[PDB]
Structures are given as structure tokens and as C-alpha cells.
């Protein structure tokens, strides 16, 4: 009942090593489905998910034209920002842009997004009203004025409320067997002694999709937030994700600990304990 589409653009300058590289990738939820790399032998939009392969030549050529044009424009933009910040021509810089639409379980734009960053710092973003901008500094204010004069926000709003949602719904239907299939995590608790009177309890969640998940350790029904080592959710490489949470407990008190797992693919939240 929750879905989104996002495109991620990365433009990187590299003085002395050619023109800036432009890469674009597209995602529906946690599934990448397209890519484009200006450094490719033959720069063209390529499929990265099985359900997008059915799109015809016009779709691919339309995508490629968009990315090829963006490639050239982001080279001008990098030159422009270098100037806005009085930076030398010797450094490498990066502009990133991410945009897309969010849908609720009952279709129609829930919210639209468009944000850009320069060297990893927020630069300019479209406000939630999809009509106004928030510029980070006086440099971004130049971009803002340029974009207002070119009706950039109006065009973006039209896309976010229109084509973005339409195509996202199309992809969701075409790839429903995977995009609309939540795979529950396979779970288990491991025990690793760390000393004579302390042991590590690690709660595992494997093979799940989407990536959103909640893993928590409780002691006597109380959250051990400050004592839990929780690793970043990581991709398995087969579309699914993995994650763990660990806590060091006093040997002999392991039963006072419970691991709680919440995920869309589970019939009901899980409560696990170490099973000797």
C-alpha cells in the first residue's frame, strides 16, 4: 500500500581526465530498473529489472535523449557552480539530483520530490507545494532565479503529478509479481560468548524485501536501544536485504532478552529468543 519512484543523477567533474561524467539510475521502491552512464562505450539507457524489458524502442530512445541532453547540461551546470563559489578549475566537484513521486495505497500523488546537492551539501530543493524553491545560499539563489524564469517548477509539478505517477503505476502493474510482493525475513538468533560471564546475542533477518524493517532487542520488555549494535541494512545481491542487531548480555540472563521483528512480509510481528 506504499510505493515510490526515484531517479538519481550524479554529475562529476574531473579536471585533466576528460569532461564530467553523468550517471543516472532509476528505482521503483527498492528495485533499480534503469541506468545510463555517459562513460559507456555507447551511452544508452539500459534495463536493470526484467519487467522493464518489455518497453519498446521509443521508450528507450526517449530515455536516452533525456539523459544525453542532461549530460551536456550538467557540464554547463558544473562550470556555473564553480563560478558561483569562486572555485578553481583544478578541483573535482559533484552535483547530485534526486526526484520522484510517492503514492499511497489509494493512488494519486501523495507527495512529490526534487532536491539537488553540490559536493554533498544541500543546494536547492523544490518545496512540498511543487511551486516554490528553497535555496541553501546566495549561489543557489542564482539557480533559483534562473529556474523561475524558465518555469522549471511548473514543468516539474506537471511531471510529478502526471507522467511520474502514471508510469510508476504502470511499472507496479508490469512488475507486480516482485514489486508488489513483500518477502518476509528468515530469522534466527545466534549466541557468541565474549567472556566467562558475557555473551553476544545476534538477531538475524535475511532474504527480505522491501528493505524497510524493524529489528529491536528488549530486556524484560524494555528497549535496549542504547545497548544495541544495529548494522545498516545491506543488499544480498538477489533483490533481497539482510540486517542484524546484537546486544552483549550477562551470561545466564539470555532469556531476559527478546528480539522483535517487524516487516511487511510477515503475517505478524515476530518475537524471538535464543534457543540453546
Amino acid at each position: 500500500g506504499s510505493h515510490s519512484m526515484r531517479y538519481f543523477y550524479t554529475a562529476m567533474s574531473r579536471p585533466g581526465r576528460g569532461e564530467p561524467r553523468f550517471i543516472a539510475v532509476g528505482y521503483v521502491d527498492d528495485t533499480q530498473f534503469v541506468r545510463f552512464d555517459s562513460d559507456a562505450a555507447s551511452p544508452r539507457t539500459e534495463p536493470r529489472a526484467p519487467w522493464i524489458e518489455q518497453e519498446g524502442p521509443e521508450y528507450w530512445d526517449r530515455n536516452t535523449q533525456i539523459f544525453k541532453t542532461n549530460t551536456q547540461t550538467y557540464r554547463e551546470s558544473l562550470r556555473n557552480l564553480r563560478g558561483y563559489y569562486n572555485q578553481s578549475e583544478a578541483g573535482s566537484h559533484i552535483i547530485q539530483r534526486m526526484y520522484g513521486c510517492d503514492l499511497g495505497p489509494d493512488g494519486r500523488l501523495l507527495r512529490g520530490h526534487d532536491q539537488s546537492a553540490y559536493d554533498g551539501k544541500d543546494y536547492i530543493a523544490l518545496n512540498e507545494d511543487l511551486s516554490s524553491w528553497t535555496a541553501a545560499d546566495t549561489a543557489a539563489q542564482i539557480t533559483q532565479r534562473k529556474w523561475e524564469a524558465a518555469r522549471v517548477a511548473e514543468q516539474l509539478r506537471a511531471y510529478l503529478e502526471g507522467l511520474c505517477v502514471e508510469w510508476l503505476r504502470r511499472y507496479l502493474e508490469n512488475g507486480k509479481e516482485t514489486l508488489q510482493r513483500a518477502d518476509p525475513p528468515k530469522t534466527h538468533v545466534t549466541h557468541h560468548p565474549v567472556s566467562d560471564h558475557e555473551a553476544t546475542l545476534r538477531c538475524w533477518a535475511l532474504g527480505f524485501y522491501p528493505a524497510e524493517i524493524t529489528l529491536t532487542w528488549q530486556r524484560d520488555g524494555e528497549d535496549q536501544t542504547q545497548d544495541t549494535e544495529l548494522v545498516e541494512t545491506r543488499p544480498a545481491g538477489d533483490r533481497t536485504f539482510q540486517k542484524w542487531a546484537a546486544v552483549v548480555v550477562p551470561s545466564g540472563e539470555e532469556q531476559r532478552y527478546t528480539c522483535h521483528v517487524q516487516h511487511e512480509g510477515l503475517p505478524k510481528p515476530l518475537t524471538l529468543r535464543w534457543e540453546p
Binding site: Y7, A24, G26, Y59, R62, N63, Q65, I66, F67, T69, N70, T73, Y74, E76, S77, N80, L81, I95, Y99, S116, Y123, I124, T143, K146, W147, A150, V152, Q155, L156, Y159, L163, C164, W167
Partner: peptide, 13 residues
Amino acid sequence: LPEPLPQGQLTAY
């Protein structure tokens, strides 16, 4: 589908 190009010149930053 990514954001379509405008009728005119794509606006740089």
C-alpha cells in the same frame, strides 16, 4: 520515466 525535456533549452543550474 524520467522528467521529460522542455520544449526549449534545458535550463542549467
